[PDB]
Amino acid sequence: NAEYLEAKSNALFLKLRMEELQVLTDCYTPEKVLVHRQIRDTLEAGVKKE
Amino acid sequence: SKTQRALQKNTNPDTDALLKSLSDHYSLELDEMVPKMQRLIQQCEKHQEYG
Amino acid sequence: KLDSHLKELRDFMYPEGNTLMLTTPELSGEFHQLGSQLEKLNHITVEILG
Numbered sequence: 630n631a632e633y634l635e636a637k638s639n640a641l642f643l644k645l646r647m648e649e650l651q652v653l654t655d656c657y658t659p660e661k662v663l664v665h666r667q668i669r670d671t672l673e674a675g676v677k678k679e
Numbered sequence: 680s681k682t683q684r685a686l687q688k689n690t691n692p693d694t695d696a697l698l699k700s701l702s703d704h705y706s707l708e709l710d711e712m713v714p715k716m717q718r719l720i721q722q723c724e725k726h727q728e729y730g
Numbered sequence: 731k732l733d734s735h736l737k738e739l740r741d742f743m744y745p746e747g748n749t750l751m752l753t754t755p756e757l758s759g760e761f762h763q764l765g766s767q768l769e770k771l772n773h774i775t776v777e778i779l780g
Contacts, residue, residue: 630761631712631715631716631761634719634761634764634765634768635719637768638719638722638723638726638768638771641726641768641771641772641775642722642726642729642771644775644779645726645729645730645774645775645778646729648778648779686732694735694738694739695735697739698738698739698742701742702742705754708754708756708757709754709756709757712757712760713754713756713757713760716757716760716761716763716764717760719764720760720763720764720767723764723767723768723770723771724767726771727767727770727771727774730771730774730775730778
């Protein structure tokens, strides 16, 4: 019983982690990453001037 | 003599040996199994937070 | 001697006086707690996937 409950807990945690990483791959495509970089650079230049 | 013979036939395991085995088994469960289960409980709580 | 052996073994097997106990009460309590926590983790997982 102790072994079974341990195996169940580990499987649920791995499912949750897999689904998180799949969502992150869908959100940050190379095109978007480039844009996010441009926005950073403008924001960083503003923070520095102010 | 009949009662002593009946005690010897029924004595595997010796009541004192049996009580010792029972006490050892009880200690083993508290030292190994109970903490393992507590660790697993704590891990589950962390996974919830990860959720 | 027989009476003493009987009393010692009985006290060990019947800790709450009324019920034959096969599992360590401390352990039985932990199994229940672990089962309950796993059920909560499974809800959160289903909810996020949904």
